[PDB]
Amino acid sequence: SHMDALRYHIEWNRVAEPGTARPAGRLLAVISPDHAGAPWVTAVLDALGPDTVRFEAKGTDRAAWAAQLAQLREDEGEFHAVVSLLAAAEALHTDHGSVPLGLAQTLLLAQALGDAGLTAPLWCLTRGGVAAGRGDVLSSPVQGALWGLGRVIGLEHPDRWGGLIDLPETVDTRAAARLTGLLADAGGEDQLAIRGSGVLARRLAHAAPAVPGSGKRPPVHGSVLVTGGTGGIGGRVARRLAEQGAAHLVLTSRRGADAPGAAELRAELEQLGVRVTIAACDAADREALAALLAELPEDAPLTAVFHSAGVAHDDAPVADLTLGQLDALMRAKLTAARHLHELTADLDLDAFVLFSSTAAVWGSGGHPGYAAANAYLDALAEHRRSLGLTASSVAWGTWGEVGMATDPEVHDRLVRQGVLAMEPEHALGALDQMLENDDTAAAITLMDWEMFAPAFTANRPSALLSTVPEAVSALS
Ligand SMILES: NC(=O)C1=CN([C@@H]2O[C@H](COP(=O)(O)OP(=O)(O)OC[C@H]3O[C@@H](n4cnc5c(N)ncnc54)[C@H](OP(=O)(O)O)[C@@H]3O)[C@@H](O)[C@H]2O)C=CC1
């Protein structure tokens, strides 16, 4: 079906064992000095060997690091690669409460390496930031955010980007040899997980065609919370939920009843018989969320959350993005979804659906902050599944008709790269397929691969797309 054809899935496939020799030239290891204690960090430093140069990235000071890096580069001459262990800094930045320190520091490292003219490829290491292989547990959604940023650094600075590697919980000599082997030569891969069974690499595939009933989706009932519910996609989702028998929709946004279109939306929904509550509630405000949940009826408990809150504006290239900009992009995604997770972890929800983006699937130049924010959502859904809780993450492509991409400027950008505008009914029908399957993660996007693949891969290859036959054909 056409709706099937919108759905894609990230998978992890086995790739080659790397060679046995460590890099010939010198590595530069980058450590977050207040977050250098984790076992995997010590194991990686041990694996890189004592000739590896160490740079402690203190605080968040681009200009200072640029100067310190420039000095290292003059002394040592060309490095073979830069190996970042900054991801281990999960604590929130003191000045930017939605930004994990390691994410902030990774952005500033990519900036400062450019400033100082270090050209060695940057590798960003994580531990538990992806779910790769069977029964794999994504233990750190925070580090998962950093894959969204990385993929964009690979699009904006392909010539000085190495890639991303997730380490296993215990980095034994085999795992260590896979790491140092990859640093010597990564066989055209750049999104990698090292596991007990071997090295895996990230792949995009067409999803399995829809099987009704397979995931045992319960009938829509009770109260359903749609954050950003007065927005473009949120309002169409609310409508669909109303058509499918929700008793009570709770729609939130910062503007609430003052949102553009809110009265027309309420009236459309109420015609269907549904009880409607529209609340002004910043999704990153934990106290406000708790007050909202405490208000719910005895006879209309929360059954589902659809997290549609989000902004994409005021992003910037990796070279330019500020921490203040990053914070504002993370807020409705990382901070809000964390709250939603924590305050609903006990409620035994039927659905907990996070609205992500293709920006986090493959990356989009100009949108590092948004890619990171959405990559957190994808990672949080996997994490929640490991806890035995329901979750999904839907990475939308471009929507037609309502929502963000109904600015000519942004719409014009996306469709020219081959990420075409979906009809809302098609997008929603594909989401219903995903929910009926009870899939954890999907991209739902209308693609022209003949446009997208050759453009996306102009500056470096994408192993990611080798498992999409239309992309392979477009490159032939
Ligand atoms: N449209 C598209 O093509 C795509 C959209 N997406 C994602 O889908 C979701 C919906 O997008 P769309 O409907 O198009 O965009 P809209 O701008 O139409 O809707 C976004 C909604 O989120 C609300 N919002 C923003 N920040 C907050 C906050 N801090 N707290 C609570 N509400 C917030 C907005 O209201 P207010 O300003 O009043 O808070 C608005 O209701 C977003 O998360 C977006 O990233 C992903 C890929 C593609």
TrEMBL record:
Annotated NADPH binding sites: G232, I233, R254, R255, D282, A283, S308, A309, G310, K333, Y370, W399, M404
Q: Which residues does NADP(+) bind?
A: G232, I233, R254, R255, D282, A283, S308, A309, G310, K333, Y370, W399, M404
Q: Which domain of life is it from?
A: Bacteria
Assembly: Homodimer. Pikromycin PKS consists of a combination of multimodular (PikAI and PikAII) and monomodular (PikAIII and PikAIV) polypeptides each coding for a functional synthase subunit which participates in 1 (monomodular) or 2 (multimodular) of the six FAS-like elongation steps required for formation of the polyketide. Module 1, 2, 3, 4, 5, and 6 participating in biosynthesis steps 1, 2, 3, 4, 5, and 6, respectively.
Its name, as the record gives it, is AmphB
Q: What is the lineage of its organism?
A: Bacteria, Bacillati, Actinomycetota, Actinomycetes, Kitasatosporales
